[PDB]
Design a protein around this ligand. Structure first.
Ligand SMILES: Cc1cc(C)c(S(=O)(=O)O)cc1Nc1ccc(Nc2c(C)cc(C)c(S(=O)(=O)O)c2C)c2c1C(=O)c1ccccc1C2=O
Ligand SMILES: Cc1cc(C)c(S(=O)(=O)O)cc1Nc1ccc(Nc2c(C)cc(C)c(S(=O)(=O)O)c2C)c2c1C(=O)c1ccccc1C2=O
Ligand SMILES: Cc1cc(C)c(S(=O)(=O)O)cc1Nc1ccc(Nc2c(C)cc(C)c(S(=O)(=O)O)c2C)c2c1C(=O)c1ccccc1C2=O
Ligand SMILES: Cc1cc(C)c(S(=O)(=O)O)cc1Nc1ccc(Nc2c(C)cc(C)c(S(=O)(=O)O)c2C)c2c1C(=O)c1ccccc1C2=O
Ligand SMILES: [K+]
Ligand SMILES: [K+]
Ligand SMILES: [K+]
Ligand SMILES: [K+]
Ligand SMILES: [K+]
Ligand SMILES: [K+]
Ligand SMILES: [K+]
Ligand SMILES: [K+]
Lengths: 493, 394, 394, 493
């Protein structure tokens, strides 16, 4: 049926009148200013990502205010995402400043703090105390973004390892280190993470991109760290290693969403398997009805070039085909030369891919996996999307305050736009990581509570008409679920 | 049910015991020697491509002779492919002489460059003449015209090549991705081999390893349902000709582990019109039997290889073993995915009208490769006067 | 999946908590008195049939008056049906006067005798006039012409009666069985009530018990999917008027225990064309919801009863409760299977545009009959400006 | 889909060119002669049933020889069926000859043998020793074909019961008695049964209609009784009471087929439930792939009348609709006035019903109930019938010696005739209780073994052409299974 859909397609037929997939942009010096951010919003940005691995609270404070200003001036809602620093293993200091590692040379990595400030080419410090327990002779240690690769030969003692330098590379003070294949038992949240998350709650961020998640128990740690005030902030778990992939089922259940970080995964898992892992994680989230983000090596060559490679274009397209809600941009928007052109092009690719995509395969697949009997919530939303296909309805209107109904509806993948009408601006922002949904804020303060709902309903249809999704004579499937639910098949005037 | 299949998958489970996708290699300075060609075959080459845009007849004669020698010393059959220069007319004067050479040297298939319409395929057929009627024409789609007339082109030709790079010159890259989907799916329906070509693992021509984007490209080509993936510069002039073929084989095997063949089987079966003619019904039913009984191999008796291609069309989730009386067929089935050919010498072994000798040879091959053991089911199909056997392995 | 359903069944399991099929009784000397009519209602009568082939207006006036009194004293709604003499013209001079009487006395439905074509239904409509436009015409198929023109007849009429005895006069009995299958299935598709009539439990008119063949006849009529079964002599002039209605109710309930409503639901849904109009989509989806969530009752807000009939068409495996503002509808829905009507007095209780009062009345009725308790699901549907609610019962 | 099939039907379109259902006739004085039997064969009889409740070995010897003679003279194969007497509870003798039971009178049924020969209206004998154990006050005892109904009031002692006569009826010496609802523990086979079965084997009967089967263990008793010589004779279990219905699953598995005796069932189970029980037993046998016979009250009024009641006509038709292989005639052929006209009419009804029947519903239903993976036998036959629907094949040819493949193929219900080619005349006869199959005997003695099979295959196609099922240009699905199997889709010349 995806096969069958391909036969009817023509590459010369006009694209769809809406883009379902959502674009996340990492903010950096190339895009932090208000006018640069207004550029990105018009280019197709829905979520602004702050990378808390770099820059101070003052720096990310600027981002928060500029993102809020740029959004207000354009009268749109943009989500703010906090990407945590997470746990990190780093080397110590070197005398004096660096150390040049010759290929074939023997060196000693020690876990003893007495060498934290007197590292040399021959012996230097690594700050993770259990390093000796988790690493075995034959294993590899990556240092400085995986540029320096060295192989562990033997245990010199319970604190130091004998290594051989595979790579000629000069390393500086306090470089990050990777332990491919090893079971790292660092805390879920670091001491710095607790501070940054605290800040996130105080500044009212919409979501946390929680780094290096390995088990379900770690998701609770992030929740505890966010505290009672932050109980409504979405936790999106970043899967970065084998543990995260292995524990994916329990992690998905505890998280509000997932991020597939292909680059971090590519460190210790062969790239061919990372492609397959992507399919797995995206499909699992689709069934769960939780947002999924395809992140990392998207249009990276377009950081310095006006156009990407062809293989990169198919990578972005196939992310949509896999069923990803979101596609992410890192250095392309943060430090790149073409921050607007890369977001505009990613939008074009997502829309082109969507035109080829058969949403009915998604609907049918996700429907068949529901056990009988279904519960009310599941039944209503699945049936609503069913009605859309049944009647060739050209829009949907979902009344959801928290965004739960909207996410559940989007889960079943209609072939029409989903308009969500919410009384909460927080929900307008948070739904930006759910594909195929657009938010309309209904001001319950200066417009009333509207228990009759038909003000909120007409507000949704008004939005659908203005965007050109529906006209007179068209069908629109309206749904309000909360379990006080209802489904209306409406004729548009 | 690809979505349902993705859920059950684990990337830490062992890979499949066979690769279904096929690999085509472009021969060049880096790989023309007998020893280099033995390296390629062991790495996973099924088809040798000669690029006639460059080199003389004497140069490509070396390739033809070396490939046949490298193959003989390894006891395997390798397909030899002629890729015409092309341009404007379909066949040029240069092409007419080149195709003349191909017939005389007995090449297995033609990669016809820059094919834009259905009658242009006939010009290539005309140039081959009566002696080369058994040579396959694989049309290369390189422009908007080829994409537009694709329905008629597929009907006239024996297969398609999706040249993404050439199509990219004029069509925006994002649309070339979709065009790949269409071209491959149409070819699957027709039951004719489709080749994904150009810009495959290009960075690995001078680098020890390719980019991640390039890896996903190869994988998704297999996911789209391509019979073949093709290497151009990577084997012709590259620094790592053996490693790039071994890596592509690894990617194809990994992708195949993730691929749900049942979706392919079911999609193609549903598009068949009732009533089905004998050949379609026999073949779809036999593939169905495999799924029905969890059979671990198939045996197809096919002389011309028509039966083998039609069975392959329905995508079993087990290896297909084709027992053929012709070596020509053995080489030609190297562009059809999920098939492995076994030569049965009708000269020094007999005609075998009872067919039990040919069948026994197929089962023996499936046993020797470790596809089926005692107690396993194996669907046998002969359809020249057809028959279907579900055989229990002793 | 009726075959699959038969496997799971046990004849020692308790019967279903409701009967879906409806029973129509012919009033006669044996049953005209108020007390006899109360006996019939308690035994399972939903519809009273007056046979106008015999008796005077004064005689049938007694029936009309007695039925309404017997029904009032039991607080139930009973449908009054006029069965015309018939013959040749559709409506005769006698029929024109009889139908005149029916309108003036406000009968609920007409059983139009010997209907052969679609325009003949219009003659019955003509005879009813503007005052009787809300009276249902159920055409009686009694000959080969009626069977032949059945498609147009069903389209014009509000329902069908399969008169097996009358059809038997000319058509061989074995073909009348098949004709019953066709007529009933066509009516199910149209979503219009179908009545199985004549030769039902005929031996039980003078005998205390019927033959086994007669029992299977009644059961299979329910299996074919008839809304109603009808008693003629058995109640009009019989020795055991109460026992025969109680026994038919028992048979219908037993058959319904064996019947797989999902087969009916699925067969009718598949015959719908995509795209569906709102009404069809709303109703099929609501019945689907019941199966999807194992809901134990349905509530339909319907004034004219169009919604109730359309929901009933899709055959839920749970009771349907129709909340109507009109008593006319309550009586008229007595020929639609699986439906029970609740009267909502719009005069002394309000218009209820919010609909929550009408809905609460339906749930209350489903509670009082023991269909749903706390924790059970109940699909509510209003479709005059439509809406669908899956309500959890408190 | 049966619903959908009904819409396309027209009662004026010509009937099918073959009848699938099979007709069983009970032989009696009305049909025992050779010419009367030749009458029945031409009328549509496939199986001759002997009722061993009545008539001596000499009487049934006559039937066997006359049935064999009548079949030979017409060059057709007819099955001979032995319907066993089975266990029976009877009263004792009365002085002198009878006893008149007044309605409302009190009488005493005793199990004490001393009253076997001096029964009166007041006290008389019943020969079943455990009668006191199985019957409780309030229960009913039926005597003389259920004409005499009396209600047990109390236990007079451990040997006699106090009863009240509900029915005015005069009863004769040694009348049969029923115990509705009671768990009768009489032996599976009686002493007389063992003698009659012995005779059956010696005379080479094809099948046993084993009376009053209550459990699976009883089926083994009949098998043991039939002995090593009779190991190939089919055992068809007669379900006559609640126990048989309750144990149906295990009984079906041990038997070669089932008979639904609606009359015997109607004794203790209300008729409405007997209709439902019929649906259950027929569908269970269809899944099992074992023949099922609808027996008893078929066209009974046609025993004395030239035509049956309309309700009887729909009864016979609905037996076919239920999915019964066979319909049976008892007194209609044994003692009736119109033995030819009743078989001819039953044939007309079966053929008319079949014309309305959608075999594809049967195929699909039985296919969906097969678990994955299927075994070879199941896979081949299901797939063969699939090919028939797939190609609109107009015939099937099955090479089966025992008839196993033929039964398995027929199980899946093709919409075309099934021609079975067997080297065994025993199989030709036995397949007469399997619907939609016709047998061709291939003489392996005077025609060879034919390992190439294509002689047997061409013999089948020859038969299919002669009956007019296939002509030139038609498809025919050929199958040989044994697990040396094969499937050919053949073009007819
Ligand atoms: C300077 C250097 C030394 C080495 C050794 C290497 S290495 O050898 O390749 O690794 C690379 C670089 N290059 C840079 C380093 C820092 C830079 N700014 C920066 C950063 C990156 C982080 C933080 C935290 C802060 S701070 O917190 O505000 O102080 C600041 C100011 C920048 C650059 C650029 O090259 C650059 C080029 C064009 C435009 C802008 C920048 C740029 O901003
Ligand atoms: C402007 C520029 C141009 C060039 C060419 C280069 S060069 O190429 O390195 O020389 C560097 C820069 N400068 C930066 C580049 C990246 C930065 N963030 C960052 C980092 C360090 C790593 C990753 C992995 C990612 S991510 O993957 O995209 O999330 C991100 C966003 C930052 C800066 C800053 O200047 C800066 C100044 C003050 C505070 C914070 C930052 C800052 O955070
Ligand atoms: C005679 C009698 C007494 C009573 C009391 C009653 S009752 O009151 O209604 O029960 C009924 C009857 N009626 C019959 C009884 C026996 C009959 N033959 C017969 C039987 C039935 C079994 C056996 C074993 C043997 S034997 O083994 O060969 O001896 C024979 C000869 C017959 C009849 C007929 O009426 C009849 C009518 C027309 C044609 C043929 C017969 C007929 O053959
Ligand atoms: C010829 C006739 C006409 C009339 C009218 C009548 S009447 O109606 O009773 O008076 C009786 C008869 N005679 C018979 C009737 C039935 C018979 N078998 C039988 C029985 C006794 C019960 C049931 C239940 C069934 S069954 O259900 O059909 O299997 C059957 C076959 C038999 C006879 C014999 O004469 C006869 C003679 C010698 C040996 C054996 C029999 C014999 O077995
Ligand atoms: K980070
Ligand atoms: K689309
Ligand atoms: K070329
Ligand atoms: K696979
Ligand atoms: K009448
Ligand atoms: K039911
Ligand atoms: K018997
Ligand atoms: K038929």
């Amino acid at each position: 049926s995806q096969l069958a859909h391909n036969l009817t397609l023509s590459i010369f037929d006009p694209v769809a009148n809406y883009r379902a997939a959502r674009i996340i942009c990492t903010i950096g010096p190339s895009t932090q200013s208000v006018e640069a951010l207004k550029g990105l919003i018009q280019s197709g940005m829905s979520v602004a990502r702050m990378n808390f691995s770099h820059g101070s609270h003052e720096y990310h404070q600027t981002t928060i205010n500029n993102v809020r200003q740029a959004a207000a001036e354009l009268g749109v809602n943009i989500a703010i995402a906090l990407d945590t620093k997470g746990p990190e293993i780093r080397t110590g200091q070197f005398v004096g400043g660096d150390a040049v590692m010759e290929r074939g040379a023997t060196c000693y990595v020690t876990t003893d703090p007495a060498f934290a400030d007197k590292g040399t080419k021959d012996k230097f410090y690594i700050d993770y105390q259990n390093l000796s327990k988790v690493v075995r002779p034959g294993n590899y240690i990556y240092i400085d973004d995986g540029i320096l690769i060295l192989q562990v030969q033997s245990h010199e003692d319970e604190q130091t390892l004998e290594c051989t330098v595979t790579n000629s590379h000069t390393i500086s003070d306090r470089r990050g280190v990777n332990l491919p294949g090893c079971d790292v038992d660092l805390p879920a949240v670091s001491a710095k993470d607790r501070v940054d998350l605290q800040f996130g709650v105080e500044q009212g961020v919409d979501m946390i991109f929680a780094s290096f998640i390995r088990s379900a128990e770690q998701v609770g740690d992030v929740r505890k760290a966010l505290g009672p005030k932050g109980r409504d902030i979405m936790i999106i778990c970043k899967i970065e290693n084998h543990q995260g992939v292995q524990n994916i089922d329990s992690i998905i259940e505890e998280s509000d969403g997932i991020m597939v970080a292909r680059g971090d995964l590519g460190v210790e898992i062969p790239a061919e398997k990372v492609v397959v892992a992507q399919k797995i994680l995206i499909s699992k989230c689709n069934v769960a009805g939780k947002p999924v983000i395809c992140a990392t090596q998207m249009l990276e060559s377009m950081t310095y070039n006006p156009r990407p490679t062809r293989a990169e274009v198919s990578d972005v397209a196939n992310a949509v085909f896999n069923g990803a809600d979101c596609v992410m941009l890192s250095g392309e928007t943060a430090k790149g030369k073409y921050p607007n052109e890369v977001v505009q092009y990613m939008a074009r690719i997502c829309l082109e891919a969507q035109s080829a995509l058969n949403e009915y395969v998604f609907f049918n697949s996700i429907k068949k996996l529901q056990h009988i009997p279904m519960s009310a919530d599941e039944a209503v939303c699945s049936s609503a999307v069913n009605s859309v296909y049944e009647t060739k309805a050209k829009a949907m209107v979902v009344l959801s305050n928290t965004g739960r109904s909207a996410r559940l509806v989007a889960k079943y993948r209609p072939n029409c736009p989903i308009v969500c009408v919410t009384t909460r601006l927080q929900t307008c922002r948070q739904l930006n990581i759910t594909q195929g949904v657009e938010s309309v804020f209904f001001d319950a303060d200066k417009l009333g509570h509207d228990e009759g709902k038909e003000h909120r309903v007409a507000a949704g249809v008004e939005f659908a008409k203005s965007k050109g999704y529906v006209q007179t004579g068209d069908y629109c499937v309206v749904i309000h679920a909360d379990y006080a639910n209802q489904t209306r098949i409406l004729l548009v005037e």
